C-alpha cells in the first residue's frame, strides 16, 4: 500500500474529483430552474466542520466550473440567514446519519427555500436511522477510513486519498492514550 | 480576461500551488528539528474562517506531501506546548492576525508562526510581518481562492481583481 498507516486505498484524489464532477453536473441541472446568481441568489453551502473543509473547498470550486455560484457557511459538528434561500449541506461522511438528521432539522426551522444534502462518503450500512442524502460522491462499506478531511483523533485529514486505517495505528495510539491516563 | 466579473487574473490556481510548494519546502525545513509526528506531535494549523478554508484545504495536503503532519482547528474572524501555524487567506491591516496570535499566545504554544496566501504589505495599520507569504498584492481589491465580495466569489479558482461595476451595481442594489 502507498501509505505505511493504511491497508487499502479506497478512493484516490483523482477518482473523487471525477465523481464530484459527475455530481456537480447533476446539481447544476437540478438547480438550473432556480436562477442562482452571485450576490443576489447564491446556493448556500453549509459545511459541517471539521472534516468537511477539504471536500467543501474542492466541491465549491467544481460547482463554480459548472456555473453554480455559492456562498459558504460553517457549522460545528461537535454542537450536534438562510430564510428563503436554497441550502445544500455538505458533510465529509454520512454513517449513522444522526449528525445530518439534526443539522437538517435545525436548518429547516429557518425556512430555507429548499434544503438538500451532499456527502463525499456515504456508509449506507452504518445507519441508526433511515436517511438518504440527495447527492453522494462515493459509497464505502462498514470500515474505518481516514483522508480527504476524515481524521483519526484529529490526524490524517490531510491525506489526499480515502484509505482504510491500519489497525496497529489505533491499537498503538489507544494504548498510549490509556498509558497516559494511568500516568 | 477569462471571467466576466474580473478585470484581470493576478494568480492562477496553478501559480498559487507552485508558490505553495515552495513555501511548504521552507516549512518542512524550518520544522525538521521539531520531530513532528501524527497523533503524538502534529503541527497545529489554526485556520481563520471564513475565507482561509480553501487555502487551508490545499495547503495541508501540500504540507503532507512534504512530510509535515498537521491537525486543523478553525477560528472565526489543547495547543499548550504544541507548535502552531496560523493560516489566513489575506493579511492587510494586520488587525485580525494580531488579535488571533495574541490570544493564542495566552495558551503558551511551543511556538506560533503565521502563513498567509495574500499579503497586502501597504495596508498595515500596525507593524506585522508574516513568517510565510505565498504572494503579495498591491492596493487592489481581489476575490477568489477563498476571498469574497459580500460572501460571493470565494469559489473562483484564481485570485482576481473584481470589476468595479460588480460592486458598484451591488452597492447601489443594497438600497
Ligand atoms: N475518520 C472517520 N470518521 C467516521 C467514520 N465513520 C463515521 N465517522 C464519524 C463521522 N461523524 C459522524 C457522522 P454520523 O452520520 O454517524 O452522525 C461526523 C464527522 O465527525 C466530526 P469531525 O469532522 O471529525 O470533526 C470513518 O470511517 N472514518
Ligand atoms: N475579499 C477581499 N478581502 C480583503 C481584501 N483586503 C482586505 N480584506 C479584508 C479581509 N480581512 C481583513 C484582514 P486584516 O489584516 O485587515 O485584519 C478579513 C477577512 O474577512 C473575513 P472573511 O474571510 O471574509 O470571513 C481584498 O483585497 N479582498
Ligand atoms: Mg464533519
Ligand atoms: Mg472525526
Ligand atoms: Mg479569512
Ligand atoms: Mg471577506
Author numbering:
A (entry chain B): 5 to 84, 103 to 205
B (entry chain A): 5 to 81, 103 to 200
Question: What do the study authors state?
Answer:
One potential new drug target is 6-oxopurine phosphoribosyltransferase (PRTase), an enzyme central to the purine salvage pathway and whose activity is critical for the production of the nucleotides (GMP and IMP) required for DNA/RNA synthesis within this protozoan parasite. For example, T. brucei has three 6-oxopurine PRTase isoforms whereas there is only one 6-oxopurine PRTase in humans. These enzymes catalyze the transfer of the ribose 5'-phosphate moiety from 5-phospho-α-D-ribosyl-1-pyrophosphate (PRib-PP) to their respective purine bases (hypoxanthine, guanine or xanthine). Here, we show that two of the three T. brucei isoforms of the 6-oxopurine PRTases are identified as HGPRTs as a reflection of their substrate preference for hypoxanthine and guanine and the third isoform is identified as HGXPRT reflecting that it uses all three naturally occurring bases. In both enzymes, the active site is situated at the interface of two domains referred to as the hood and core and is primarily comprised of three pockets identified as the purine base binding pocket, the 5′-phosphate binding pocket and the pyrophosphate (PPi) binding pocket.
To explain the mode of binding of the ANPs, crystal structures of HGPRT-I in complex with compounds 1, 2, 6 and 7, and HGXPRT in complex with compounds 2 and 7 were determined. For compounds 2 and 7, we have determined structures of complexes with both HGPRT-I and HGXPRT, thus allowing a direct comparison of the binding modes of these two ANPs. However, compound 2 binds differently to the two enzymes. In the HGPRT-I.2 complex the phosphonate attach to the linker occupies the 5´-phosphate pocket and the phosphonate connected to the attachment occupies the PPi pocket. However, in the HGXPRT.2 complex the situation is reversed and the phosphonate attached to the linker occupies the PPi pocket and the phosphonate of the attachment occupies the 5´-phosphate pocket. Although the phosphonate groups are swapped in the two structures the hydrogen bonding networks in the 5´-phosphate pocket are virtually identical in the two complexes. In the PPi pocket, the phosphonate groups are oriented at slightly different angles in the two structures, this is due to the fact that the linkers/attachments are different and the presence of Mg2+ in the HGPRT-I complex. Nonetheless, both binding modes result in the L53-K54/L86-K87 peptide bond adopting a cis conformation. In this location, there are fewer interactions between the compound 2 and HGXPRT compared to HGPRT-I and this difference is the likely reason for this compound having a higher Ki value for HGXPRT compared to HGPRT-I (6.54 μM vs 0.11 μM). By contrast, the binding of compounds 1 and 2 is very similar in HGPRT-I and human HGPRT.
